[PDB]
Design an enzyme around this catalytic site. Structure first.
Site, PDB file in Angstrom:
ATOM      1  CD  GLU E  59      41.780  70.348  16.273  1.00  0.00           C
ATOM      2  OE1 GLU E  59      41.541  70.695  16.725  1.00  0.00           O
ATOM      3  OE2 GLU E  59      41.211  69.922  15.030  1.00  0.00           O
ATOM      4  CG  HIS E  60      45.325  73.246  11.579  1.00  0.00           C
ATOM      5  ND1 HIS E  60      44.676  73.541  10.769  1.00  0.00           N
ATOM      6  CD2 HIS E  60      44.455  73.442  12.570  1.00  0.00           C
ATOM      7  CE1 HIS E  60      43.371  74.121  10.243  1.00  0.00           C
ATOM      8  NE2 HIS E  60      43.158  74.192  11.856  1.00  0.00           N
ATOM      9  CD  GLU E 136      40.009  75.970  10.129  1.00  0.00           C
ATOM     10  OE1 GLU E 136      40.809  75.536  11.531  1.00  0.00           O
ATOM     11  OE2 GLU E 136      40.270  74.665   9.401  1.00  0.00           O
TER      12      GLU E 136
END
Ligand code: 9XE
Lengths: 99, 196, 65, 74, 445, 239, 415, 59, 378, 46
Positions: E59-60, E136
């Site tokens: 996703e990143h 994160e």
């Protein structure tokens, strides 16, 4: 010096080490000890909290730790001494002043 | 991170039915509860059996002891009392009058006036056999022992205040409210009677 | 009419523990009954004998009853 | 003092299972027997020796009372 | 123009499929803007222990360049046409979508295709986004909500892939090479597992042809060995208690095993959850709120906030509630919450179920407002149900629920059932599991 | 003052769940009746107590009617004598203890109602006493009236050997040997002191079985509830 | 039947606008010129309490009935405040609109504000404010306005601490009676017929009637020891409705006005790249553009590490100076227009945001400007107009606000 | 087909009303069964010793 | 919020019996508190039901107790439940106190001292209970033990005749012994509530002697289910005695009626007093013997002052453990010796045991604590 | 009827920010709005 043989024997006979406790965890809480505990830094307090919780849990099951995990006699830090010593030293000053 | 935390393996502790991590525990949930609640239910049935017996014994304690039941009833021999005569007995710390009644006493107490009596009772419902009348020998007003074969009405009379009982034990002329008391009894063999 | 008791008392009497105790009894029998003026008696020795005897009698008397 | 006011605890995780998910008697003999022997071995020579001494002082004193009531050969 | 009527003339959802197996789904209306995207049956549940957090790692990297548009070229082109590019990953669903001008739908679909298929995954870009994820993971430690829910799953579905967090353990984040990421992609990103969903001003016919042009290369075959089937996940009645008195408020999350996506019971369960509802300290209602849990919570200041949830996965789920409260209120919150579950099971009324129905009717009709939530409803419904369920059908399922249904359905999942409990913070008061478990029944009904 | 304690005879009621031999009780009663009841009282046993134990209601009524007993007053104010009934207790030999002493040269014959319970050894003791009478050993003699018994405390007793072979004929025709007569009367004296015996042991059985069931069940309920805590794992996760 | 907006202005001033779209749901909004700006120094925070105070007892309905009656039918009642407007909004399924409408009219035209209910509500001011001020953007923007103005727009949306517990019933009555009037009200609707709205507005919303914002230029500095420093620097911009305002909106999107790609590096954002050239540690920057009836503020907002706040703000300010000096190509201004054009259409994409624009326009302007006309007005902004907006900002008197450990945050006269 | 314990749960133990009725019914059936069965064990253990066994000789 | 914390009566029950925080690790030695309560209730019921059939007149008393066991329905099972229930009480009491000594629970001074009072009251109750049947051991036990108070100078002889209400243990003594024996259990009930009222200020100690605030579990269900199991095992012990050995812990001589001439051979109190009876007989002087019998119980109130160890429990204390088990074995010796005749070698053993009892408490166990401390550098 | 993106509690510790990727979106771009309701959590907008 000479009785260090007996001190080492007694330590293991007593057997608080089998619950992963240090000697200062077993000290009976009077008002001095309560104050000494209250003056412990975050780290030393939370370790005390866990070690006891673990011992109580073991005691509940009537079990002990594995021998590897038992508190070694040599590594038994006297973590409460400097706080308790001064709490007592303080009280005796007030008791003197009161006469 | 808190994502590093992984839940310990509980396989040693788990029930067989929930060991398989690739299968749904919902099949076995109906069963696993059933087993554990059966144990609870069985236990309660056992405790109920016990408590019933324990309470019931304690309650039994307060009911009449064997020695009080021993004096409850009294046997009387009917051939030992002749026709006409009264015979007194000792019953529950009281006199107990049994009376053999004649052909005359039966018929004379049968056609008595029902209304005139202070306590209206007919004779055929005061006794179980017509020729035997069993009564407590305690005068109902203030407690005396009536004397047999005396009085105006020819039955029992009390010299305490002024009561006159007939041959059926009913008050006729005097201060007594109730009649002489009819106890509970049954004839066994034709020669004997048990009162109580 | 013979008592089962006196039969079994005899049967038990001929065992090592009884007969050895019965000899102890007979020793002081013809010690005190031979000697004059001593306040010693022989109760103890009889009780040693009876303890051993009646223990055995108990073990099988009730078979005959 | 109710729950919520007992004491201060920090950074202690506790995992546990429902009693309907697990057994009442896990390894009851397998692990129980050795744990009993461990516990018995651990306390035996603190607990037992006094009661051995009682047994001895008892059986000594009892049959000494019996001997004393017998006659002495004199 | 009544409500029943309004539902009949809501635009229908179109449904077509490509040779490879990619489903194209579309809702059309005269709108100058649109939303389009790719929804994929992929997430943490499909990951093993050695590659957990790969789908999150991807996703990143997704928006950091492609083979056709290296580096920030992808980024520049989205920005300069006023488009908005976005992604999310759950335990079962990864999704990339773009919000754009309706006239720019061709380029929108083209760019989505370039992201999915031709993702650069550069060596240096990987090692950069490695540290970003670790930070994160640290931010996420400070969100008590996030932590307690990850704990609920971890204990509820323990020893399975559903226990795993989406982001993965830091050990995996630190070690996952680009070989792992490309292997993960070719296994899970397959046409039959994927849906191209679109909503706004767009002809369905055009979307289907755009899907051909750009998503035709997508692989939709599996080799003889292996094909990603999800095994079922064992729910366990369990507790996880992270005691940390240094935090000011306690987070508790409790749930029973829910039925999972396909089951019709979910409609009755939504109605029951709507009755109990949700609350926090900024709500205007207070004592006069309809939910007894909320009115009691507000009048006695028990909690700061709570919500009921019903989280659905394939053949299972999490049905319960989350609350945040003072360290002295946890026992009382649990008592009233469990008390509401029992009251619905045993003794739900017609008028309160009518309220729940009306809430749920309103809930899902106003949620589908704007193209993005409608696009997302299309994308995910095709994955979960196999189709988009029209509002008229939801309404029919809702009208079928009466007080008797809410009782019978709630009694199935709640009554005398083992929950999963997760607590975090000053949770000394948090009731013992036996007391919680005994609170899942009444000695009367 | 040496002491010879009795041996443990294998009674038919010796064991945990073993009841009294009621036919032995029926004989033993007759040994009290025919032999003891002119010397010992037995105040707490009445003729009704025999019913449903060793005799029927009708048999016990016959045994009660056989004996004299005082009752009164009648209306004249006099104390009369009447035939006994079930409600009457077993009649005392003498009017009082002082009378009893005179009839037995100073010694008072104890009441037998509780004699099994009131002496160490119980029925084992009494059986040994009754059958253990023997000639004294050498060096011994007591006062004229005190006989030698090795089981009596102090070795000398004031009771003449009461039982011997054919001292009575039993109703069921059992050969009345000295040992048989002692065994039966002891079994009766056991019941005299402890009527509850048979019920007590019936209750014992039912208690043992209920405990056999409930203890492991309640212990299982205990382990079930406690399994939450016994399983639990702890983890210390400091920053 | 594809439907477009209907519009009416009654002779008493009140605007009714409504698109009947035959959806299942119905949104109704009563927009009122009664935002925080219409407070004075004697009744500060009155409009904050008034915002929390719907669902208190009205004349035609109890506090209990408002909550229960609305919840019964699955509905919602919200109250939204800007500095200039208040917006009372109700949602439901279309069959229950006349029940919700009855409640909406009670709330707005006939609230009782009972002493005991009003007093009971005072602690909610503390809770609501406390929550809001968890966001540091709320500190800074509320201070920024307070710094930048002398009077009306200076007022905070949240009640000042000293007033909490002291907003009286009389003040609430006064505020409603003086601001909730036909001449200041617009009744907007989706999923409802225009004629029945009109008739409601004539019968229940005909109620009789009841100063300019002076820009100042100042600074306010919250010292609080955070490792991050939030900061905003603005100058006086242009009134909403004027053509110059459109130039500022384009300048906003040239410079950079928030993110387009998730986790993206913002490659087209002029500010973000200008700042990211010098400093690579964590930060965020965006152009800030508020626009009001009297006035406006335009500038930028930084979020930076405490020690680098000086560098970040100066870097951002330098970027506006080069735009103001003339460094600005068509591809940037075209891209910026495409952002703004897309952002506007996307904001009115949902029926929530559409209602907000219809009502918003109805108060600040006479009637509804359709989306096609708004995009044409964006295209009308020339490159020259954007450079003038930037030039205005550079030479304009500044207002500033910061929160954090401000040891390295410069003052306005250090910049 | 579901297991035996499961049938017992769904039919008898789930509703607390049925759980209680089950205990009360079971207690009656258990009482008489256990008493009759335990008395048999007692009277067999003491065969011919009880009045019940020797009653017939005097009637 | 619930009606367990709100209602004035349920509030007390909820905090003292349901949500009570208990240590996770308390062992089987903590069950004896609840079992003492069960014993107390058990005695009161059985006692009350016996009092419905008993009479305190000297002529009828022995007869009434036999009338209970023979004629009253299940009067035997009630009677022997009550007599063995008194034994079960004292078993439970000494286990309960021993726990206190070993694990140092006596540091709870107020709880502990009220304990001593409870002990003394249950003793007074059980002493006067054993008189009520009016058998030999009843009458002669009461005579000798009461008449110990004549050893007090000046007043002693008056004091004894005032307890008696006459010149021997006779009609007025039995009647008042029935009255005091009835009322005292209810007084115990009250003092036991004060006992717990103090216990709930601190909560329970546990086997480690280390504070358990970090690992408290709610009393319900954990200890409600244990106490059920405990009660079940208490009832087993009781009914094993009542149904298989009802006379085992009593004496035969209390089945002959009380005779003021005929003295029993070896007169003695019931088993649970024999330890203190042996201590009395060790000392040759009578007043000294009474002061030693008195100090053999009251020394319990001294124990907290004699504590020297820096650790609270004996768990981690080997020397003390051994000395403790010596003290238990010594008490078992005193109980044995108490039951014997006064002769060789039971005189000398009794003297030796009695010295060892006081030596262990006053000298050796305190010294052992201080030695243990110096072995840990304390 | 629908619950909000964020449930709001007072006295609850804030969520930390440790990187660029999480910090973007925070820089305020437009003036404040404040909404309050019956059913939905209270929010403050840019
Ligand atoms: C650290 O453990 C503690 C702490 C406090 C207390 C406390 O305050 C009190 C009052 C008791 C207590 C006292 N007497 C009797 C009982 C009892 C009575 C009936 C029962 O039911 C059953 F037997 F199962 F049928 C079970 C127990 C309990 N026990 C305690 C234990």
């Amino acid at each position: 010096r000479w009785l260090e043989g007996i001190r080492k024997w007694y330590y293991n006979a007593a057997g608080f080490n089998k619950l992963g406790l240090m000697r200062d965890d077993t000290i009976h809480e009077n008002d001095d000890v309560k104050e000494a505990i209250r003056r412990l830094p975050e780290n030393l307090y939370d370790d005390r909290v866990f070690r006891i919780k673990r011992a109580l849990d073991l005691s509940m099951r009537q079990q002990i730790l594995p021998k590897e995990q038992w508190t070694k006699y040599e590594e038994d830090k006297s973590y409460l001494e400097p706080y308790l010593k001064e709490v007592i030293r303080e009280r005796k000053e007030r008791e003197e002043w009161a006469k | 991170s808190h994502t590093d935390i992984k839940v310990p393996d509980f396989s040693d502790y788990r029930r067989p039915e929930v060991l398989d991590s690739t299968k749904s525990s919902k099949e076995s949930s109906e069963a696993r509860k059933g087993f554990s609640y059966l144990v609870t239910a069985t236990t309660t049935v056992g405790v109920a059996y016990a408590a019933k017996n324990v309470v019931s014994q304690f309650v039994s304690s307060m009911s009449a002891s064997a020695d009080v039941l021993a004096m409850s009833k009294i046997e009387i021999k009917l051939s030992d009392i002749p026709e006409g005569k009264n015979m007194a007995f000792k019953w529950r710390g009281k006199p107990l009058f049994v009376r053999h009644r004649t052909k005359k006493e039966i018929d004379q107490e049968a056609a008595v006036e029902v209304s005139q009596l202070r306590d209206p009772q007919h004779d055929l419902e005061r006794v179980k056999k017509p020729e035997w009348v069993i009564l407590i020998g305690v005068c109902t007003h203030l407690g005396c022992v009536p004397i047999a074969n005396a009085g105006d009405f020819g039955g029992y009379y009390c010299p305490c205040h002024g009561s006159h009982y007939d041959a059926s034990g009913r008050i006729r002329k005097g201060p007594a409210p109730l009649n002489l008391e009819v106890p509970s009894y049954e004839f066994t063999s034709d020669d004997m009677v048990i009162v109580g | 009419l013979v008592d089962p008791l006196t039969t079994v008392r005899e049967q038990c009497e001929q065992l090592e523990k009884c007969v050895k105790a019965r000899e102890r009894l007979e020793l002081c029998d013809e010690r005190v009954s031979s000697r004059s003026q001593t306040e010693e008696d022989c109760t103890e020795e009889l009780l040693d004998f009876l303890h051993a005897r009646d223990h055995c009698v108990a073990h099988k008397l009730f078979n005959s009853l | 003092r109710q729950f919520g006011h007992l004491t201060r605890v920090r950074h202690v995780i506790t995992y546990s299972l429902s009693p309907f998910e697990q057994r009442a008697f896990p390894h009851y003999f397998s692990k129980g027997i050795p744990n009993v022997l461990r516990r018995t071995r651990a306390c035996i020579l603190r607990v037992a020796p006094p009661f051995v001494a009682f047994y001895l002082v008892y059986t000594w004193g009892t049959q000494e009372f019996e001997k004393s009531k017998r006659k002495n050969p004199a | 123009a009544t409500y029943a009527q309004a539902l009949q003339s809501v635009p229908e959802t179109q449904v077509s499929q490509l040779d490879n197996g990619l489903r194209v789904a579309s809702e059309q209306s005269s709108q100058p803007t649109c939303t389009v995207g790719v929804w994929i049956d992929a997430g943490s549940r499909y990951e093993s222990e050695k590659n957990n957090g790969a789908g999150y790692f991807v996703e990143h990297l997704a928006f950091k360049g492609t083979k056709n548009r290296p580096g920030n070229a992808l980024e520049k082109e989205v920005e300069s046409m006023g488009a908005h590019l976005n992604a999310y990953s759950t335990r079962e669903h990864t999704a990339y979508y773009i919000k754009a001008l309706s006239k720019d739908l061709p380029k929108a679909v083209e760019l989505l295709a370039d992201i999915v298929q031709n993702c650069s995954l550069e060596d240096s870009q990987i090692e950069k986004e490695r540290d970003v994820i670790l930070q994160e993971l640290q931010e996420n430690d400070t969100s008590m909500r996030d932590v307690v829910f990850n704990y609920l799953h971890a204990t509820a579905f323990q020893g399975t892939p559903l226990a795993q967090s989406v982001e993965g353990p830091s050990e995996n984040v630190r070690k996952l090479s680009r070989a792992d990421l490309t292997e993960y992609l070719s296994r899970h990103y397959k046409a039959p597992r994927m849906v191209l969903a679109a909503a706004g001003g767009l002809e369905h016919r055009q979307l289907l042809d755009l899907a051909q042009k750009h998503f035709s290369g997508l692989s939709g075959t599996y080799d003889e060995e292996t094909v990603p089937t999800l095994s079922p996940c064992r729910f366990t009645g369990s507790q996880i208690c992270h005691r940390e008195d240094g935090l000011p408020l306690a987070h508790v999350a409790i749930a029973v095993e829910g039925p999972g996506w396909a089951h019709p019971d979910n409609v009755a369960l939504q109605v029951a959850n709507a009755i109990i509802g949700h609350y926090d300290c900024t709500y205007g209602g207070g004592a006069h709120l309809s939910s007894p849990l909320a009115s009691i919570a507000a009048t006695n200041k028990l909690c700061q906030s709570f919500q009921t949830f019903n989280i659905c996965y394939a053949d299972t789920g999490l049905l319960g509630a989350h609350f945040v409260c003072d360290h002295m209120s946890i026992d009382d919150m649990m008592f009233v919450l469990q008390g509401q579950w029992m009251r619905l099971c045993t003794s739900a009324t017609e008028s309160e179920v009518l309220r729940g129905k009306n809430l749920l009717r309103n809930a899902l009709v106003s949620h589908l407002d704007g193209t993005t939530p409608v696009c997302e409803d299309i994308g995910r419904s095709l994955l979960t149900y196999g189709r988009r369920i029209p509002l008229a059908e939801w309404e029919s399922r809702i009208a079928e629920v009466d007080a008797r249904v809410v009782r019978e359905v709630c009694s199935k999942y709640f009554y005398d059932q083992c929950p999963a409990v997760a607590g975090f913070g000053p949770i000394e008061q948090l009731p013992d599991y036996n007391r919680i478990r005994s609170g899942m029944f009444w000695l009367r009904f | 003052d040496l002491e010879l304690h009795p041996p443990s005879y294998p009674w038919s009621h010796r064991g945990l769940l073993s009841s009294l031999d009621h036919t032995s009780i029926r004989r033993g009663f007759q040994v009290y009746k025919q032999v003891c009841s002119s010397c010992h009282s037995m105040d707490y046993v009445a003729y009704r107590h025999l019913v449903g134990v060793c005799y029927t209601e009708d048999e016990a009524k016959a045994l009660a009617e056989e004996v004299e007993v005082q009752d009164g007053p009648n209306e004249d104010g006099e104390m009369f004598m009447r035939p006994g009934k079930l409600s009457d207790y077993f009649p005392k030999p003498y009017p009082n203890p002082e009378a009893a002493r005179a009839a037995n040269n100073g010694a008072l014959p104890p009441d037998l109602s509780y004699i099994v319970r009131a002496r160490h050894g119980g029925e084992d003791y009494v059986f040994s006493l009754l059958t253990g009478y023997c000639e004294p050993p050498t060096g011994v003699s007591l006062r004229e009236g005190l006989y030698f018994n090795p089981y009596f405390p102090g070795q000398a007793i004031g009771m003449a050997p009461p039982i011997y072979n054919e001292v009575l004929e039993f109703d069921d025709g059992t050969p009345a040997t000295m040992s048989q007569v002692a065994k039966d009367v002891c079994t009766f004296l056991r019941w005299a002191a402890e009527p509850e015996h048979d019920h007590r042991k019936r209750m014992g059985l039912k208690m043992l079985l209920m405990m056999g069931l409930l203890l492991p069940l309640v212990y299982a309920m205990k382990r079930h509830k406690w399994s939450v805590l016994k399983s639990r794992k702890l983890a210390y996760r400091p920053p | 039947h594809p439907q477009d907006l209907e519009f009416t202005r009654l002779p008493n001033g009140l605007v009714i606008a409504s698109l009947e779209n035959y959806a299942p749901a119905s949104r109704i909004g009563l927009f009122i010129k009664a935002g925080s700006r219409y407070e004075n120094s004697n009744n500060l925070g009155t409009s904050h309490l008034l915002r929390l105070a719907s669902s208190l007892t009205t004349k035609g309905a109890s506090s209990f009935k408002i909550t229960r009656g609305i919840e019964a039918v699955g509905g919602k009642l919200s109250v939204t405040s800007t500095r200039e407007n208040m917006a009372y909004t109700v949602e439901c399924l279309r069959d229950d609109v006349d029940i919700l409408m009855e409640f909406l009219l009670n709330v707005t035209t006939a609230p009782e504000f009972r002493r005991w209910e009003v007093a009971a509500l005072q602690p909610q001011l503390r809770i609501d404010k406390a929550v809001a001020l968890q966001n540091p953007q709320a500190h800074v923007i509320e201070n920024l306005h307070a710094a930048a103005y002398r009077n009306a727009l200076a007022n905070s949306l949240y009640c000042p601490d000293y007033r909490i517990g002291k907003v009286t019933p009389v003040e609430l009555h006064d505020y409603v009676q003086n601001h909730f009037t036909s001449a200041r009200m617009a009744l907007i609707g989706l999923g409802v017929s225009h004629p029945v709205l009109k008739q409601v507005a004539e019968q229940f919303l005909n109620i009789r009637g009841g100063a300019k914002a002076k820009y100042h230029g100042g600074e306010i500095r919250e010292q609080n020891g955070d490792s991050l420093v939030h900061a905003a620097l603005v100058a006086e911009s242009a009134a909403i409705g004027s053509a110059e305002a459109n130039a500022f909106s384009v300048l906003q999107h040239v410079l950079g006005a928030g993110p387009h790609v998730k986790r993206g590096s913002n490659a087209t954002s002029s500010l973000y790249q200008a700042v990211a050239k010098g400093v690579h540690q964590p930060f965020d920057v965006s152009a800030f553009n508020a626009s009001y009836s009297d006035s406006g503020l335009f500038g930028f907002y930084t979020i930076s590490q405490a020690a680098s706040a000086g560098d970040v703000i100066k870097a951002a300010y330098n970027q506006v100076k080069t735009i103001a000096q003339g460094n600005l190509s068509n591809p940037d201004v075209q891209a910026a227009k495409n952002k703004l054009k897309a952002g506007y259409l996307m904001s009115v994409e949902s029926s929530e945001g559409f209602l907000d624009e219809v009502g918003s326009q109805a108060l600040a302007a006479g009637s509804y400007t359709p989306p096609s006309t708004v995009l044409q007005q964006i295209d009308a902004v020339a490159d020259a107009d954007v450079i003038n907006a930037a030039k205005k900002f550079v030479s304009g008197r500044k207002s500033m606000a910061a929160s954090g450990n401000l040891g390295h945050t410069p003052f306005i006269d250090e910049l | 087909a579901p297991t035996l314990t499961a049938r017992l749960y769904s039919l008898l133990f789930r509703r607390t009303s049925t759980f209680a009725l089950t205990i009360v019914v079971g207690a009656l059936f258990f009482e008489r069964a256990f008493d009759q069965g335990a008395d048999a064990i007692y009277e067999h253990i003491n065969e011919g010793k009880l009045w019940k066994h020797i009653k017939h000789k005097y009637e | 919020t619930n009606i367990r914390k709100s209602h004035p009566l349920m509030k007390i029950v909820n905090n003292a019996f349901i949500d009570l925080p208990a240590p996770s690790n308390i062992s089987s030695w903590w069950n004896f508190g609840s079992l003492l309560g069960i014993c107390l209730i058990l005695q009161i019921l059985t006692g009350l039901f016996l009092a419905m059939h008993y009479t305190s007149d000297t002529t009828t008393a022995f007869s009434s107790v036999t009338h209970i066991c023979r004629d009253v329905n299940y009067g035997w099972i009630i009677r022997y439940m009550h007599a063995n229930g008194a034994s079960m009480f004292f078993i439970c009491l000494y286990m309960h106190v021993g726990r206190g000594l070993y694990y140092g629970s006596y540091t709870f001074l107020e709880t502990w001292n009220i304990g001593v009072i409870l002990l003394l009251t249950v003793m007074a109750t059980a002493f006067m209970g054993y008189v009520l049947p009016w058998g030999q051991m009843s009458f002669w036990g009461a005579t000798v033990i009461t008449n110990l108070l004549s050893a007090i100078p000046y007043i002693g002889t008056n004091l004894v005749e005032w307890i008696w209400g006459g010149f021997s243990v006779d009609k007025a003594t039995l009647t008042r012994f029935f009255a005091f024996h009835f009322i005292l259990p209810f007084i115990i009930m009250a003092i036991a509530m004060v006992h717990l009222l103090f216990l709930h200020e601190t909560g329970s100690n546990n086997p480690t002697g280390i504070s358990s605030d970090v690992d408290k579990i709610p009393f319900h269900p954990y200890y409600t289910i244990k106490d059920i199991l405990g009660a079940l095992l208490l009832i087993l012990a009781l009914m094993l005695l009542v149904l298989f050995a009802p006379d085992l812990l009593g004496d035969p001589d209390n089945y002959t009626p009380a005779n003021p001439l005929n003295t029993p051979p070896h007169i003695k109190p019931e088993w649970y007093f024999l330890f203190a009876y042996a201590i009395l007989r060790s000392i040759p002087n009578k007043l000294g013997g009474v002061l030693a019998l008195a100090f053999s119980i009251l020394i319990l109130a001294l124990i907290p002052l004699l504590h020297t160890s820096k650790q609270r429990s004996m768990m981690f204390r080997p020397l003390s453990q051994c000395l403790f088990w010596a003290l238990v074995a010594d008490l078992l010796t005193l109980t044995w010796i108490g039951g014997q005749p006064v002769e060789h070698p039971y005189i000398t053993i009794g003297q030796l045991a009695s010295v060892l009892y006081f030596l262990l408490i006053l000298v050796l166990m305190p010294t052992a604590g201080t030695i243990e401390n110096k072995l840990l550098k304390w | 009827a629908v619950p909000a993106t964020s449930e709001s509690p007072v006295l609850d510790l804030k969520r930390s920010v440790l990187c660029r990727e999480s910090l973007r979106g925070q820089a305020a771009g437009r003036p404040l709005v404040a909404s309050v309701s019956l059913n939905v959590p209270a929010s403050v907008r840019y």
